[PDB]
Ligand binder design. Sequence first.
Ligand SMILES: [Pt+2]
Ligand SMILES: [Pt+2]
Ligand SMILES: [Pt+2]
Ligand SMILES: [Pt+2]
Ligand SMILES: [Pt+2]
Ligand SMILES: [Pt+2]
Ligand SMILES: [Pt+2]
Ligand SMILES: [Pt+2]
Lengths: 205, 205
Amino acid sequence: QSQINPHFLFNTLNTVAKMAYLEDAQQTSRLIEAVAAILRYNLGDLQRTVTLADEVRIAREYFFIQQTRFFDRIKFSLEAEPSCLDQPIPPLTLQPLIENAFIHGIETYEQGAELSVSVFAENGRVVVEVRDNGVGMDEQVKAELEALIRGEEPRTRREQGIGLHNVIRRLQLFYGVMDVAEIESALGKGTTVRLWLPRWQGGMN
Amino acid sequence: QSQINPHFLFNTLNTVAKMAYLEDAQQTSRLIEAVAAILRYNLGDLQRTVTLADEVRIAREYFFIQQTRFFDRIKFSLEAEPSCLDQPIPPLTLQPLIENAFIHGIETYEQGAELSVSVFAENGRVVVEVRDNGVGMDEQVKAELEALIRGEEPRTRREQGIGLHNVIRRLQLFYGVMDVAEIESALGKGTTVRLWLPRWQGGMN
Ligand SMILES: [Pt+2]
Ligand SMILES: [Pt+2]
Ligand SMILES: [Pt+2]
Ligand SMILES: [Pt+2]
Ligand SMILES: [Pt+2]
Ligand SMILES: [Pt+2]
Ligand SMILES: [Pt+2]
Ligand SMILES: [Pt+2]
């Protein structure tokens, strides 16, 4: 179950933010503002519709926080075509991919990790690429994800926040198409998770 | 599922704490230290054995945080017999009861809410009393909790962090006895959840 209570955490973060302002701790206030933004977004209704612009905004807050702590170890890159950012999308689509690539990087490198996010149009899809230079994801994990993308329910296992499996399922349900992602990975050559989202000039629901 | 990632939250809180120290934001640092203490404790192994002394320490951190935000609305009281505090107990036993009583209070009162925690020996049990002056818990919720205490599995319902049900079950399993709690509640007269823990001069497992 969840051993943490998020509502208490969020309110407490607000109290910390108030004290940081009262003590004129400007850099502390900026960090709290970033993590409060992420927490608030992740606590929202998971069935709402947002746009890629909202997802990218949250990504920037994440990179600001992580850069503060890990500046010597990992390089972050974020690029996006503006015309793609009004794409409707389920919330918390991008963050699980970014967290995945971040863990890949810091587990593989003392320094030299790389995490890149790219958002761009290709034919009639909006492509979202999240790339890391890690050691490459496990072959069986990759196979089960690809089976899920094809519509085959993978093996149910005990003790199975939001992972790549849930992201893929929510995208398939949201867009009404199964082929919403592909995974590119090889030993020593890193991992790219590439989302292929049907271009929707507007449909939240 | 969990829409929040706690490991990122904890690390980020550490980064905020570092910045607060660097900016000499002393009151902000104290608040972060308190919530970091709670988060770290709640993220520990749920199957470890702690003592009531550890549970009460976490309670004090909680009251410090809540008093900072709610000082005009609610009065907190915490009393304990020292000889009881070496009692072994499952972690996160007390916090769910305190959070329950806190919600009761702030939902009932604009100001005038009361939350009291008392720990004391009675015959061969350690009693833990958590009392609120709220409107009284719902009769059906109380009945199902009492059935659980008696060993009857209550009605399973869809969409059912840690609640009073889980606390009771963990206590029954930990101590090997079913009659580990009682609930005292009446309309307009508040709620007391009273734990009756077999006095163990030592047994963690
Ligand atoms: Pt909340
Ligand atoms: Pt709260
Ligand atoms: Pt709360
Ligand atoms: Pt992986
Ligand atoms: Pt963790
Ligand atoms: Pt992290
Ligand atoms: Pt992490
Ligand atoms: Pt209640």
